């Protein structure tokens, strides 16, 4: 707790000259707080003094996850630049930093993670790749980068939904178009034999239906 207060808000270094102590409520370590409150200097010091950058807190998040969630560019650079750091870390629900990067509309961390060799076709416990999340959220730029760096465009999640399908359900016209551009298979049914066109017609997403029907065919 004493080391944690300096990092979370000379102090970090002097106490060190405890460390991996987890809190009772959240279960985060000093590194986690440094990441969350986005205190860059503190995270560097904690790492310097050989800290474990992969301790999971009560929900499975490591400091890197905390880093993306809090959009802390500095702590994030520091953790990815760190070798020990697991980039394909996993929360209890299977969520990965590459995925939070897709979801929270954070500038560039998704590509930095990709460039620093994170697995792109990794998936959450529901079996959703970042490309799937990218479609749900209609994050076109992330969708392009995931695709250029070899994502599986026709990947199916536990419910047999492809990324094109989630875009069809939410009506992500721009991402839906990009997936089509890349020849995404528009004929892959979900677990209840439903075409993305079908999910789209139901939600009255007329443009996505227009695209499924006439865009980049044969």
């Amino acid at each position: 707790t004493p080391l944690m207060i300096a990092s979370c808000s000379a102090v970090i270094s002097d106490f060190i000259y405890s460390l991996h102590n987890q809190t009772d409520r959240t279960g985060e370590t000093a590194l986690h707080l440094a990441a969350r409150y986005s205190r860059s200097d503190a995270a560097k010091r904690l790492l310097e003094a050989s800290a474990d950058a992969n301790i999971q807190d009560n929900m499975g998040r490591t400091p890197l996850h905390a880093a993306v969630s809090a959009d802390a560019q500095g702590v994030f650079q520091i953790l990815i630049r760190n070798r020990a750091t697991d980039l394909d870390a996993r929360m209890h629900d299977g969520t990965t930093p590459l995925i939070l990067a897709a979801r929270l509309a954070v500038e560039g961390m998704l590509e930095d993670l990709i460039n620093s060799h994170a697995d792109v076709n990794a998936v959450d416990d529901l079996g959703k790749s970042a490309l799937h999340w990218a479609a749900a959220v209609n994050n076109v730029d992330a969708a392009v980068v995931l695709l250029k760096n070899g994502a599986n465009k026709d990947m199916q999640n536990n419910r047999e939904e492809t990324p094109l399908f989630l875009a069809a359900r939410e009506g992500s016209y721009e991402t839906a178009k990009v997936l089509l551009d890349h020849f995404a298979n528009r004929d892959i049914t979900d677990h209840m034999d439903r075409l993305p066109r079908d999910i789209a017609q139901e939600r009255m997403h007329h443009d996505i239906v227009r695209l499924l029907d006439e865009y980049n065919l044969v």
Binding site: C8, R25, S69, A70, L104, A136, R169, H191, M192, D193
Partner: protein
């Protein structure tokens, strides 16, 4: 007609005080025997549909205190098979708080591997309630009495899950009785059916309650303990044995599957089993044995059927009175993570069926909310000041509750509870 009303601060306070939520709820099997030709193999157990919650009554009263027949304020309801071109069957909910769907079945005309039950539901005066669906159900062309490996699960009971148990007298659909529970003891009603926790135990297990369960799928030969998911009363230790041709085997390692006839041996009393005597549940011994030292013949009445069970559950509240639309689709909030801290705290919510028209409320405070997608939503933790006059920082832990609220006033309760804490 009265324009949609934004839930007000005061209305929220009232709700937090009273809290008379209305909640639908659907219990059912995870599997279903597909019916061929013009047959009809009804879903067993029969999908029950309880209507829990003090709110349903408050709604009944409110409707009448506005000129409604006993017949105008009666929740109605039909059950069906997802998107199938058939006919939804009606459930009679008069006076009853629940109702089973005794004659549901899936033809082979339907090619889907899965489907989920659709339960349409409105009030007598055609006022609309919503459409709630069951968790997915898998279609099987016939149970597999053959061998079952541990790669194609979803078909193997697993310590922790729930299951229903029913006995079928001489092949007559009208006999079927399910292990149930009422008045503290185990019945065998051919009316209701209970879901049971089927915990796996290591042979070196103790006596009664306060025992420890261990993960793992269930194969015959293990010591399992069945508990009533509702009442709590449970059956003393047992050993599920694969059966066939009236013989309760002892030498069987095979993993228990879906819709598998099996007998339940007791706590090494001797060789006594658990049976149904066309009435209630009473002891037994299974005299026959001289066939082999590992193939104890048993009397027809304890060869139950094991089937795994799930439960879909939705709950809402009319926080601003009647609404033009249905309360369906209901928001389930599975995970609630904090994002950052202090001056910027935000909250990522993940769950199902979210929609652009919800704001999340922290106690009686409405917080800005950004819709990401059906399963993800973000919102902004409101300054601690909004809960403690002076406070420019969190002087002490203040735990308010989190809750989703549609734009027309429906309020969907969660269970989660954001707690403000001092920034270390």
């Amino acid at each position: 007609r009265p324009p949609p009303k934004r839930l007000t601060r005061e209305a929220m306070r009232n709700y937090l005080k009273e809290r008379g939520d209305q909640t639908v709820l659907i219990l059912h099997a995870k599997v279903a025997q597909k019916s061929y030709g013009n047959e009809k193999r009804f879903f067993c157990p029969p999908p029950c549909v309880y209507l829990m919650g003090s709110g349903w009554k408050k709604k009944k009263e409110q409707m009448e205190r506005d000129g409604c027949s006993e017949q105008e304020s009666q929740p109605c309801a039909f059950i069906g098979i997802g998107n199938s071109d058939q006919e939804m069957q009606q459930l009679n909910l008069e006076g009853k708080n629940y109702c089973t769907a005794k004659t549901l079945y899936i033809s082979d005309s339907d090619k889907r591997k899965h489907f989920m039950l659709s339960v349409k539901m409105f009030y007598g005066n055609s006022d609309d309630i919503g459409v709630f669906l069951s968790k997915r159900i898998k279609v099987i062309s016939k149970p597999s009495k053959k061998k079952q490996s541990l790669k194609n699960a979803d078909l193997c009971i697993a310590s922790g899950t729930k299951v229903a148990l029913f006995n079928r007298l001489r092949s007559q659909t009208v006999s079927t009785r399910y292990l149930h529970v009422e008045g503290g003891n185990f019945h065998a009603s051919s009316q209701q059916w209970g879901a049971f926790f089927i915990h796996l135990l290591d042979d070196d297990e103790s006596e009664g309650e306060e025992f420890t369960v261990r993960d793992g799928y269930i194969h015959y030969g293990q010591t399992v303990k069945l508990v009533c998911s509702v009442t709590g009363m449970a059956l003393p230790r047992l050993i599920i044995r694969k059966v066939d041709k009236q013989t309760a085997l002892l030498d069987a390692d095979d993993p228990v599957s879906q819709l598998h006839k099996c007998a339940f041996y007791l706590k090494d009393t001797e060789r006594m089993y658990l049976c149904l005597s066309q009435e209630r549940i009473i002891q037994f011994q299974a005299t026959p044995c001289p066939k082999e030292p590992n193939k104890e013949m048993i009397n027809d009445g304890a060869s139950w059927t094991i089937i795994s069970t799930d439960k879909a559950e939705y709950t809402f509240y009319e926080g601003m009175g009647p609404v033009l639309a249905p309360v369906t689709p209901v928001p389930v909030v599975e995970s609630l993570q904090l994002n950052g801290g202090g001056d910027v705290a935000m909250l990522e919510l993940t769950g199902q069926n979210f929609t652009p028209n919800l704001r999340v409320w922290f106690g009686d405070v409405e917080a800005e909310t950004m819709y990401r997608c059906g399963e993800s939503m973000l919102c902004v933790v409101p300054d601690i000041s909004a809960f403690r006059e002076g406070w420019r920082w969190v002087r002490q832990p203040v735990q308010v509750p989190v809750t989703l609220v549609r734009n027309d006033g429906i309020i969907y309760s969660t269970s989660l509870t954001f707690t403000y804490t001092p920034e270390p």
